Design a protein around this ligand. Structure first.
Ligand code: NAG
Length: 310
């Protein structure tokens, strides 16, 4: 139950903290009783095979805010009690597939803000047990395999926010997914099959996604959807019946969009009235035309614009 020189060991050596230190490598003599390890804010560059083999009881392992660029094969061997593994704010150029060793208890994996360039096929089929995955802020990402998320039949939260994404990737593997964060992407056009097989999804976020066009039927698959955020995008209108199938959708953010208020958006105003009736004049405003400018989309009706069948 010894404490390493550079760490502060609480309890009977269950909670070990080693932060704000100038650690170049992972310290030794970590007591076997450790269930929590915080090595955040250090200068660690490499993690080696069996570095943690002796820690049977480790549940939470925080290796974030470091310089980690190399994670050798079987680096996390010997950690069958491990739940959460944090690796954000590091210098990983690729996802550390090899490091994984069917860690059935692993539930959270945090990799945001790393210079990862691509997520290859079957990247996480050593860790099917994952519930939360954080792949946000991967600003040098250029490719996601179609089979990248295969095996993650238990994933519930995914974060692909702030990754330069011209297109939504294949997420048909993520059968049980509930929250998807796609904000801060270059998602220009949203085609009909963009969220195929995400029938379990409840919250979807597309804030600051440079979304100009949403084609008809683009959300048909999201049958469980409750919340949507299309705020701070470039939407001028939404296609007919975009929400008719989404029976449970109760919260929609539409603000900060150059909404053009003509009869193409008549349906939406009525959807707003039926779905969120307490909102009389707030807070999704028309930019065009003048005379309708500043007005809440959902306060408009048939007298405000001329309507045809084509
Ligand atoms: C409805 O009003 C609420 C309460 O202020 C606000 O948060 C929301 O932006 C409004 N919803 C829409 C769809 O404009």
């Amino acid at each position: 139950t010894s404490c390493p020189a550079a760490c502060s060991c609480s309890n009977q050596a269950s909670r070990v903290i080693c932060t704000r230190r100038e650690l170049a490598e992972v310290p030794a003599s970590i007591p076997v009783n450790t269930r929590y390890l915080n090595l955040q804010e250090n200068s660690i560059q490499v993690i080696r095979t069996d570095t943690f083999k002796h820690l049977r009881h480790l549940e939470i392992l925080q290796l974030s805010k470091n310089l980690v660029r190399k994670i050798e094969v079987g680096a996390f061997n010997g950690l069958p009690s491990l739940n959460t593994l944090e690796l954000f704010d590091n210098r990983l150029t690729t996802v550390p597939t090899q490091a994984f060793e069917y860690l059935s208890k692993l539930r959270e994996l945090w990799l945001r803000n790393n210079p990862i360039e691509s997520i290859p096929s079957y990247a996480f089929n050593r860790v099917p047990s994952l519930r939360r995955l954080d792949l946000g802020e991967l600003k040098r990402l250029e490719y996601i395999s179609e089979a990248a998320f295969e095996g993650l039949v238990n994933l519930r939260y995914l974060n692909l926010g702030m990754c330069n994404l011209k297109d939504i990737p294949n997420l048909t593997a993520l059968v049980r997914l509930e929250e998807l964060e796609l904000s801060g992407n270059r998602l220009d056009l949203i085609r009909p099959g963009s969220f195929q097989g995400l029938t379990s999804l409840r919250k979807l976020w597309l804030m600051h996604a440079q979304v100009a066009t949403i084609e008809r039927n683009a959300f048909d698959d999201l049958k469980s959807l409750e919340e949507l955020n299309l705020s701070h995008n470039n939407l001028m209108s939404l296609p007919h019946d975009l929400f008719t199938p989404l029976h449970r959708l109760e919260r929609v953010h539409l603000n900060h969009n150059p909404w053009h208020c003509n009869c193409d958006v008549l349906w939406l105003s009525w959807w707003l009235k039926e779905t969120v009736p307490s909102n009389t004049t707030c807070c999704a405003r028309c930019h065009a035309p003048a005379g309708l400018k500043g007005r809440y989309i959902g306060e408009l009706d048939q007298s405000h614009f001329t309507c045809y069948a084509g």
